[PDB]
With several copies, the nearest count.
Chain A
């Protein structure tokens, strides 16, 4: 029957996906699709194949953003979900959680991740467990669950650093670690990890990783209120993203948002509006409603003083389960209004900061 022959090739396929080896991953994708052709109707093997195709696509889109094959692969994967068991059930929940995170579906992604976490003792490969620990630490950071994100990211970075050639994941883990130290107001303890990632990103010549390193470095200077140095980090990050075929990635909007916020705080009103312009039009073109709403908040704050639109956006982001952006944006409004000596409305946004922090603290 040679059902294990397809089984071993799909596992090898997964190994090359984690190594970010597109040539090897494409070779084995073709090998599996030729073996699948002359094979009995094994529903678990076909579901295993469909899951790895979904994982293979997640790697490609990460390296080449969409100018949707993901949706068709998701439909076939969600056609047989009963009678699942063993490591295949782990792969199903874990991969679905990865997809939900890409769709800003945080509550669904957490739920999928926690189901995959229950079957972690079925994962003998330490590298595969490092993939899980990194991905669960990533979403915990975006939830500003710092202690849980640190608990998982240390387990991931140690397993990755034990092996070699997982350098891409090593850069990404350096992002998570430093960004956790940043959330704890330790920018001095975060710049080492980001400069570490920037160095190794320049070695493998990974343009978006270089830009993400510049973006995370600019977030440190922003925390230190080194707005000039922060804007320069943001500028070069937008430059490397655009100069290497990443100007259509949703993640460049994060850099545009901070650069708009930074130049506004530098009292460079004129330059700031043209930055908020480019960011909000690009958010509309990429159909990213969440990033567009964040640019609306910046425009309503520094340009319009439309506090009702500010409140509705903060309420929108809370229903989006993005309480950290609720805190960051309400903190932006509180400082600006307190600087403008409008202490009446500045109190109300300081209260919203306190509200978001308590909600973040509630956790589960």
Chain B
């Protein structure tokens, strides 16, 4: 899953 780029 993609990380949090906020």
| Residues in A lying within 8 Å of B, measured CB to CB | 138, 141-142, 171-172, 175-176, 178-179, 182, 208-209, 212, 215-216, 219, 251, 254, 257-258, 261, 294, 324-325, 328
Binding site secondary structure of chain B:
loop
| Complex contacts, B2 vs chain A, CB 8 Å | 141-142, 179, 254, 324-325
- What is the CB-to-nearest-CB distance from A256 to chain B, in angstroms, rounded to a whole number? 10
Interface residue from A179, A219, A261 paired with B5 (Cβ < 8 Å)? A179
| Complex contacts, B1 vs chain A, CB 8 Å | 219, 254, 257-258, 261, 294, 325, 328
Of the A-B pairs whose beta carbons lie under 8 Å apart in the complex, a sample of 10, sorted by A's number, is A141-B3, A142-B5, A171-B6, A176-B5, A178-B3, A254-B3, A261-B1, A324-B2, A325-B1, A325-B2
| Complex contacts, A294 vs chain B, CB 8 Å | 1
If A216-B3, A325-B1 are given as contacts, then 15 extra A-B residue pairs at C-beta distance below 8 Å, sorted by A number, are A138-B5, A141-B2, A141-B3, A141-B5, A172-B6, A175-B4, A178-B3, A179-B2, A208-B6, A212-B6, A254-B2, A257-B1, A258-B1, A261-B1, A294-B1
Binding site secondary structure of chain A:
helix
For B4, the closest partner residue in chain A by CB is A212
Contact A251 B3 (CB under 8 A): no
| Complex contacts, B6 vs chain A, CB 8 Å | 171-172, 175, 208-209, 212
- What is the CB-to-nearest-CB distance from A3 to chain B, in angstroms, rounded to a whole number? 36
| Complex contacts, A219 vs chain B, CB 8 Å | 1, 3
Those 8 A-B pairs whose CB atoms lie nearest each other, nearest first: A212-B4, A179-B3, A172-B6, A138-B5, A216-B3, A175-B5, A215-B4, A142-B2
Q: Report the bound CA distance from A258 to B4 in whole Å.
A: 12
Contact B4 A254 (CB under 8 A): yes
| Complex contacts, B4 vs chain A, CB 8 Å | 175, 212, 215-216, 251, 254
Q: Report the bound CA distance from A182 to B1 in whole Å.
A: 12
| Complex contacts, A254 vs chain B, CB 8 Å | 1-4
- What is the CB-to-nearest-CB distance from A166 to chain B, in angstroms, rounded to a whole number? 13
Q: Report the bound CA distance from A294 to B1 in whole Å.
A: 9
Q: Report the bound CA distance from A175 to B5 in whole Å.
A: 5
Q: Report the bound CA distance from A251 to B4 in whole Å.
A: 8
